[PDB]
Design an enzyme around this catalytic site. Structure first.
Site, PDB file in Angstrom:
ATOM      1  N   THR A  16     -12.684   8.562 -12.206  1.00 52.02           N
ATOM      2  CA  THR A  16     -11.691   7.981 -11.329  1.00 52.02           C
ATOM      3  C   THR A  16     -12.072   6.633 -10.677  1.00 52.02           C
ATOM      4  O   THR A  16     -11.233   5.978 -10.063  1.00 52.02           O
ATOM      5  CB  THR A  16     -11.262   9.018 -10.263  1.00 52.02           C
ATOM      6  OG1 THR A  16      -9.995   8.648  -9.722  1.00 52.02           O
ATOM      7  CG2 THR A  16     -12.281   9.105  -9.151  1.00 52.02           C
ATOM      8  N   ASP A  55       0.812  -1.202   0.000  1.00 52.39           N
ATOM      9  CA  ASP A  55       0.000   0.000   0.000  1.00 52.39           C
ATOM     10  C   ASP A  55       0.857   1.270   0.000  1.00 52.39           C
ATOM     11  O   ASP A  55       0.453   2.301  -0.530  1.00 52.39           O
ATOM     12  CB  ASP A  55      -0.930   0.004   1.208  1.00 52.39           C
ATOM     13  CG  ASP A  55      -2.082   0.959   1.031  1.00 52.39           C
ATOM     14  OD1 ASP A  55      -2.779   0.853  -0.004  1.00 52.39           O
ATOM     15  OD2 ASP A  55      -2.286   1.813   1.915  1.00 52.39           O
TER      16      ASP A  55
HETATM   17  O1  LIG Z   1      -7.811   2.801  -4.501  1.00 52.21           O
HETATM   18  C1  LIG Z   1      -9.139   3.228  -4.835  1.00 52.21           C
HETATM   19  C2  LIG Z   1     -10.299   4.143  -4.299  1.00 52.21           C
HETATM   20  N1  LIG Z   1      -9.778   5.581  -4.012  1.00 52.21           N
HETATM   21  C3  LIG Z   1      -9.239   6.395  -5.094  1.00 52.21           C
HETATM   22  C4  LIG Z   1     -10.458   6.678  -6.062  1.00 52.21           C
HETATM   23  O2  LIG Z   1     -10.065   7.491  -7.161  1.00 52.21           O
HETATM   24  C5  LIG Z   1     -11.052   5.282  -6.591  1.00 52.21           C
HETATM   25  O3  LIG Z   1     -10.098   4.674  -7.479  1.00 52.21           O
HETATM   26  C6  LIG Z   1     -11.470   4.375  -5.339  1.00 52.21           C
HETATM   27  O4  LIG Z   1     -12.432   5.186  -4.626  1.00 52.21           O
HETATM   28 CA   LIG Z   2      -8.732   6.419  -9.418  1.00 50.93          CA
END
Ligand SMILES: OC[C@H]1NC[C@@H](O)[C@@H](O)[C@@H]1O
Ligand SMILES: [Ca+2]
Ligand SMILES: *[C@@H]1O[C@H](CO)[C@@H](O[C@H]2O[C@H](CO)[C@@H](O[C@@H]3O[C@H](CO[C@H]4O[C@H](CO)[C@@H](O)[C@H](O)[C@@H]4O)[C@@H](O)[C@H](O[C@H]4O[C@H](CO)[C@@H](O)[C@H](O)[C@@H]4O)[C@@H]3O)[C@H](O)[C@H]2NC(C)=O)[C@H](O)[C@H]1NC(C)=O
Ligand SMILES: *[C@@H]1O[C@H](CO)[C@@H](O[C@H]2O[C@H](CO)[C@@H](O)[C@H](O)[C@H]2NC(C)=O)[C@H](O)[C@H]1NC(C)=O
Ligand SMILES: *[C@@H]1O[C@H](CO)[C@@H](O[C@H]2O[C@H](CO)[C@@H](O)[C@H](O)[C@H]2NC(C)=O)[C@H](O)[C@H]1NC(C)=O
EC number: 3.2.1.113
Length: 475
Positions: free
Chosen positions: A466, A340
């Site tokens: 995202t 991580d």
């Molecule tokens: O690791 C993933 C988590 N947090 C980042 C966001 O952009 C999305 O990829 C998910 O909510």
């Molecule tokens: Ca992302």
């Protein structure tokens, strides 16, 4: 070959869907070890909505219909928890909008009930309508943590960079589909402060801005520059908005180019033990933080996307270096899944990791893996942009490692130590992005070409939000 692999990913998806439907639907998520349920996302059924775009792309009609019928009975006005404007926007809003664009376009022949499809847009609008008061501040920079019943908030004085800059894609898409400009104006006004940073000291290098914004005046409250969690998504959306509509958002592109170039010149970093590896560092007042996160690995993909769209071979070459670095954190561990978070500062190499560092080029700060998709995401772009088979193999290697160490009878679970046999201990947690991202990118890397696939140059007709939800571009 690829067909069998593609079917294998669909099996992994079906596996988690069955377990989720069996023990948790319609709660937000399945708890993979105890076979229970949890609601970390306001209880509207996060795992069902996030799974929508993936199910549609995989052509799983039964799954799509079940999700559509649940979306129809969701009352977004009711929840017993405070709501995150950012999380709700990238999972729920984008998830429903994505399903709409997909089912209304390339996947029009998958569902019969046109009323359940149109319901996606209606609900997206209802959701934005319940959340829009968040933007009603002095500057336009919203409060991220709100109470939708009382209209109250966190009491926060600043809002994060990513949480502020990762809303424009989906709120603008809602405006373009409804004809109601309110949604785009709100999000774009909030974004405006990020495109023209003040004070100037908050922008250390051209394009690289601070990590927090004052809600009262829209000025940055610090000069900490980073591509890590909390910042990441802001830069990601700069270039994606340009792909969405190059005419309206040329300015976003210019800002991303500056950021991309300053990042290459100043954040680029190589570990002492492995000069051949490249990671990104964080910058704060002339000091460099030599550490990174799994989240940051979305970077290679951003550089690859902007590189092919702008036809900048230098951004493409750099993106591949970032991809290689992230691949390095994956194939160096025992489980073949990356940590991580990690570091490479010579002065802080832990004693028990000295020799790992010397050969791998980094030490593990947090060895857990919470089913994140950023590394596979960038592998996916690398394959689409270069067309080289190696990157597709890396996606497959990662998927098998995940399927082999995170799988439980009901689904997939987060793991405590990627550098120990079987990942150490399993967490009783399965985030919704397992359905939305890990399974989608893994599948797309081996599935047939289609409009929803990332394309080179200016051929993209879809752009990914995202949370890996494909959104149709403007016009
Ligand atoms: O690791 C993933 C988590 N947090 C980042 C966001 O952009 C999305 O990829 C998910 O909510
Ligand atoms: Ca992302
Ligand atoms: C575990 O992770 C490892 C780290 O990512 C990974 O290592 C390799 O990963 C890449 C495998 O393809 C590899 O990248 C290639 O490197 C080629 C050689 O680079 C050397 O020569 C060039 C000279 O130009 C130097 O600049 C380099 O510093 C280095 O000395 C390079 O030729 C190649 O580039 C071609 O292909 C790309 C597209 O793939 C084109 O864009 C480009 O134009 C060229 O046509 C590419 O960069 C990388 O170097 C290597 N990393 C390291 C540090 O070893 C392992 O493969 C992985 N292991 C497993 C089993 O998965
Ligand atoms: C959101 O604000 C509402 C106010 O409308 C909160 O509602 C509760 O407020 C008190 C909390 O102990 C009590 O009066 C009730 O539990 C309830 N009453 C109302 C006004 O509905 C609600 O708790 C807030 N949400 C959270 C958990 O932050
Ligand atoms: C992912 O893991 C599953 C489960 O371990 C693999 O499927 C298995 O299904 C059955 C046991 O669950 C058996 O048939 C086998 O152990 C196995 N399936 C096969 C190929 O026989 C699945 O193969 C794994 N995915 C991949 C591609 O590695």
């Amino acid at each position: 070959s690829n067909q069998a692999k593609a079917d294998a990913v669909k099996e992994a998806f079906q596996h988690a869907w069955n377990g989720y439907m069996k023990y948790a639907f319609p709660h937000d998520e399945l708890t993979p070890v105890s076979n229970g349920h949890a609601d970390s996302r306001n209880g509207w059924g996060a795992s069902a909505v996030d799974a929508l775009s993936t199910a549609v792309i995989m052509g799983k009609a039964d799954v799509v219909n079940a999700i559509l019928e649940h979306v129809a009975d969701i009352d977004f006005s009711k929840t017993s928890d405070t709501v995150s404007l950012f999380e709700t926007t990238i999972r729920y809003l984008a998830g429903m909008l994505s399903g709409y664009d997909l089912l209304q376009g390339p996947a029009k022949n998958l569902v019969d009930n046109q009323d359940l499809i149109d319901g996606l847009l209606d609900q997206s609008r209802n959701l934005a309508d319940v959340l829009k008061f968040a933007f009603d501040t002095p500057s336009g920079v919203p409060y991220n943590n709100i109470n939708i019943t009382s209209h109250g908030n966190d009491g926060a004085t600043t809002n994060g960079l990513a949480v502020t800059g990762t809303l424009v894609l989906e709120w603008t898409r809602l405006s373009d589909l409804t004809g109601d400009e309110e949604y785009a104006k709100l999000s774009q006004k909030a974004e405006s402060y990020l495109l023209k940073p003040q004070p100037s000291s908050s922008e250390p290098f051209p394009g690289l801005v601070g990590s927090s914004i004052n809600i009262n005046d829209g000025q940055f409250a610090d000069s900490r520059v980073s591509w890590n969690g909390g910042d990441d998504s802001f830069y990601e959306y700069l270039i994606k908005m340009y792909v969405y509509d190059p005419k309206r958002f040329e300015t976003y592109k210019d800002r991303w180019v500056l950021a991309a170039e300053s990042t290459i010149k100043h954040l680029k970093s190589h570990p002492k033990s492995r000069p051949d590896l490249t990671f990104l560092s964080s910058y704060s007042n002339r000091n460099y933080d030599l550490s990174s996160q799994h989240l940051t690995c979305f970077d290679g993909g951003s550089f690859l996307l902007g590189g092919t769209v702008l036809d900048r071979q230098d951004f493409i070459d750099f993106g591949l270096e970032l991809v290689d670095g992230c691949e390095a954190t994956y194939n160096s561990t025992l489980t073949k899944i990356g940590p991580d978070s990690w570091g490479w500062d010579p002065k802080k190499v832990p004693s028990d990791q000295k020799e790992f560092y010397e050969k791998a080029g980094f030490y593990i700060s947090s060895g857990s893996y919470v089913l994140r998709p950023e590394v596979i995401e960038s592998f996916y772009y690398a394959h689409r942009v270069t067309g080289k088979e190696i990157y597709r193999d890396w996606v497959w290697n990662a998927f098998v490692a995940i399927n082999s160490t995170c799988r439980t009878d009901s689904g997939f679970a987060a793991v405590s130590d990627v550098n120990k046999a079987n990942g150490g201990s399993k967490y009783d947690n399965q985030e919704s992005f397992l359905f939305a991202e890990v399974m989608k990118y893994s599948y797309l890397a081996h599935s047939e070409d289609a409009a929803w696939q990332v394309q080179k140059g200016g051929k993209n007709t879809f752009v990914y939000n995202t949370e890996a939800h494909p959104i149709s571009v403007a016009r």
